[PDB]
Symmetry: C4
Subunit: 90 residues, 4 copies
C-alpha cells in the first residue's frame, strides 16, 4: 500500500532529522536524540529533558508543527495494518 509506504518513509526521514539535530546541537547520544524526537512528535513528552539552547527550542517548536500531523497519520495507518489480521480472523 503506497499511502502506508510513503507515510513510513516520511516518518523515518523526519525522525532521522531530529536524531541528527538533537545529537549534534543538544549533545544527546543518538538513541536519546531519537527517543526525544519520538516522544515529542507523538506528544507523549519527556519528563527528564528539554532543549537547553535557544536554537534547540526554536527547532523543537517548528519540528512539532512540521511533524505531528504526519506522525499521527502514520500511527493510524500502522494501526489498521497491525489490527486487521486479528479482526479478519475473529
Amino acid at each position: 500500500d503506497k499511502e502506508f509506504q510513503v507515510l513510513f518513509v516520511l516518518t523515518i526521514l523526519t525522525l532521522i532529522s531530529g536524531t541528527i539535530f538533537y545529537s549534534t546541537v543538544e549533545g544527546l547520544r543518538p538513541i536519546d536524540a531519537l527517543y526525544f524526537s519520538v516522544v515529542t512528535l507523538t506528544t507523549v513528552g519527556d519528563g527528564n529533558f528539554s532543549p537547553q539552547t535557544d536554537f534547540g527550542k526554536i527547532f523543537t517548536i517548528l519540528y512539532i508543527f512540521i511533524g505531528i500531523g504526519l506522525v499521527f497519520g502514520f500511527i493510524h495507518k500502522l494501526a489498521v495494518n497491525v489490527q486487521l489480521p486479528s479482526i479478519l480472523s475473529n
Copy 2:
C-alpha cells in the same frame, strides 16, 4: 461489535506486555509498570520516569508507535459503543 472486542483484547494484551517489560527490564514495581504503560500510550506521559536502559528506550519507541493506535482505537470504540449510549440513556426523563 467484533472490532470493539478485538481492540479490547489487544489493548489488554498490550498493557500486560508493558507491565511485564518495565517491571523486568527497568525494575519497576508491577503497579508502576502498568501506570507507566497507560500514561505513555494515552500520551499523557509520566513527569518523572523515563526508561534508563537502551533496551527500554528502543522498546518504548516501538511500543508507542504500535500501542497508541490500539489504545486510541479502543478509547474511540468505548466512547461510541458504551459511553455515548449510556449517557443518552441516562438523559431520558422517566
Copy 3:
C-alpha cells in the same frame, strides 16, 4: 446548545471528582489537584507530580479512560463556539 451544555456539565463534574480525589488521597492543595486533573485528562501531563499511593495510581488509570473522550469532545465543541464569531465576521 444542549450538546455543548451537557458536555460542559459532564466535564465540570469530572474535574470536581478529580479535585476531591487528589486533594484528599494525594494531599494536594485544591488548585494543584484541579491542575493535575486538567493536565492529565487533556494529555498535557505534568512534569513535577505523579501519584504516590497505589490507590492514586489505580484511580488515575481509570480516570484517564473514563474522562479523556469526554474532555476532548468538550474541547472540540468549545472550539466551535469560540471560533465561530471570528469566522462569521471574516
Copy 4:
C-alpha cells in the same frame, strides 16, 4: 480558505498571549515562555516546568481548554490545505 486564515491568526494571537503571560507572571525568558506555550497547547508538555503561581495555574487551565482546540484546528487545516497538497505535488514524476 477563510477558516484557515482565521485559525492561523487566532493561533498566533494565542501564542503571543502565552508568551506575554508566562514571561510576566512566571518570570520566564520570552523564548522559554513561547516554548512552554507551544508544548502545552500541542499537549506534548514540558518535562521540567510547571506554573508556580496560583495565577499561572488558573491561567494555564483556561489556556489549555481554549488553546488546544484552536491549535489543533490550525494543525488540521495546515495538513489539509498546505502539507498534503505539497506532498502530493512533490510525488509527481516529472
